[PDB]
């Protein structure tokens, strides 16, 4: 609740093409503003990530090498056409606020793509076009187009594939060809990307979280003037460390605690742990899980 900006992993919330916001997004901590991550905490907006708040974001995942970047990491909306992203971008209805030059997402290939404008141009309110900016200052970050969370995983999902009842096309993916009169609508569809899989769209979203005493399940803080503090400096029980630490019952169950000489205090992050998802009856460990609003066409049978 109070430690939403104490990030798991490195905490990097910048896109590679945009550097000048590194003083406050690299990493994100208790203090400072970050246009790439702050927008994720407006309540009611991004509910799935706000549920699993202590799991990584997309930019956060690519800078922890969990999610790979696509070839050209940014598609142009001013070039000859700038096609590599447009085919995937049109099928999704999104809404970009003003002053944003870039907006990122998980492509259908499982990598992080982004759509970006030339300097001092901004994205329109549908994220499909670039226009000469109307203000004086552009946002120095990239706007996430997906309610999403990510984690490290080695679970092979190459055998997996999108299966949805009565669906002909979901976003880019064409599951089959249909002869019946179709119903077409923008739907908020869930999805998940795995180790060796593409984007797998889902009918139901069934998740389960196994809690553990691993490092990413904790948040440590020292001297509101709180600043983050690496847990790797705290020595475990029967180990060696450079600092001294105290924690809750969960933290002191594994690491040694000293109530008087501790540099920092570590709590157990609520809603943290290994998350698994149920795809067509089988439980798997996904790399990322999210929602996105895409064009779904359905048969009448």
């Amino acid at each position: 609740d109070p430690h939403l900006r104490n990030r798991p992993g490195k905490g990097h919330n910048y896109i590679d093409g945009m550097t000048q916001e590194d003083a406050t997004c690299k990493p994100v901590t208790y203090a400072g503003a970050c246009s790439s991550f702050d927008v994720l905490l407006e309540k009611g907006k991004f509910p799935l990530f706000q549920s699993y708040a202590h799991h990584r974001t997309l930019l956060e995942a690519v800078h922890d090498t969990i999610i790979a970047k696509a070839d050209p990491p940014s598609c142009d909306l001013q070039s000859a056409h700038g096609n590599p992203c447009m085919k995937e971008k049109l099928v999704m209805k999104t809404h970009c606020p003003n002053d944003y030059q870039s907006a990122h997402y998980l492509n259908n290939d499982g990598k992080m793509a982004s759509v970006k404008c030339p300097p001092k141009y901004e994205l329109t309110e549908d994220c499909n076009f670039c226009r000469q900016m109307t203000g004086a200052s552009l946002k120095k970050g990239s706007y996430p187009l997906q309610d999403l969370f990510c984690q490290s995983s080695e679970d092979d999902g190459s055998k997996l594939k999108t299966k949805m009842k009565g669906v002909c096309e979901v976003g880019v993916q064409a599951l089959k060809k249909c002869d019946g009169q179709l119903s077409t609508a923008h739907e908020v569809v869930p999805f998940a990307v795995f180790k060796n899989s593409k984007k797998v769209y889902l009918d139901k979203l069934d998740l389960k979280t196994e809690e553990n005493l691993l490092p990413d399940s904790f948040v440590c803080f020292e001297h509101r003037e709180l600043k983050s503090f690496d847990i790797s400096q705290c020595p475990k029980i029967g180990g060696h460390g450079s600092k001294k630490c105290t924690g809750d019952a969960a933290f002191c169950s594994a690491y040694e605690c000293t109530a008087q000489y501790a540099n920092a205090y570590c709590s157990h992050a609520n809603g943290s742990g290994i998350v698994q998802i149920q795809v067509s009856g089988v439980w798997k460990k996904p790399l990322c899980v999210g929602y996105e609003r895409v064009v779904v066409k359905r048969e009448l049978s």
Epitope: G17, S79, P84
Partner: antibody, heavy 115, light 110 residues
Framework: QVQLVQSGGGLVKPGGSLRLSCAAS????????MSWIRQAPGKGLEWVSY????????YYADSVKGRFTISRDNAKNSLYLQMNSLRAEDTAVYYC????????????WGQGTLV | SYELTQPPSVSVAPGKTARITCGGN??????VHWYQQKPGQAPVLVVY???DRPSGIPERFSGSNSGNTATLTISRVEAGDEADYYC????????????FGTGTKVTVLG
Amino acid sequence: QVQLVQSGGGLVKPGGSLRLSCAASGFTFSDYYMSWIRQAPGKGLEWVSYISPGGSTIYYADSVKGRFTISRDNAKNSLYLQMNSLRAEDTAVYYCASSADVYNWFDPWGQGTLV
Amino acid sequence: SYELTQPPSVSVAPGKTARITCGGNNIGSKSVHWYQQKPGQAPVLVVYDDSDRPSGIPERFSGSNSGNTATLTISRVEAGDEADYYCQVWDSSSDHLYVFGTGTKVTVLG
């Protein structure tokens, strides 16, 4: 520190071919676009081509389009420019540059190589 | 094609201030970059993003951009500032995508 360092011969007869190679050491080089900018003797700078961090989506300038081929070997941290069907208008000093995204400002450049 | 115009010569006495104007149609809407090149060298980025400096460039260098003119201003000119200064922009038109100016040679008097 970052040190884009170049090699490659630069004395040929018209219609010939050459090959410049720019080796990178100090950044990741897998996340940065790479461009080639030439400078005629005494004149200013002309951009020639750019290659994306992954190797796909290459762009050339119509002055050079069709003749040169820019490639990269991210494994061995290198960036190649193969020149074919050369002629006197190409005689210049060629530099490699890194931008970190397609719209950006060409931070550190190679040392230069005459042709 | 989008062209950037640049005065070929600029003389300035040491201690005075030097000014170099990059002229492009509607250039206030693009990000302007300034490189410095000494003889026998490679161009070095002295200014990017219309007004900002990479680490290593002294506070003597300042960038500005408005309307149809973007100016690089070198305060406290030193004899070592004799060089070619080039402006550069991105332009997704007519095949160049990175338009360098004609270049300005700054020579220090005295």
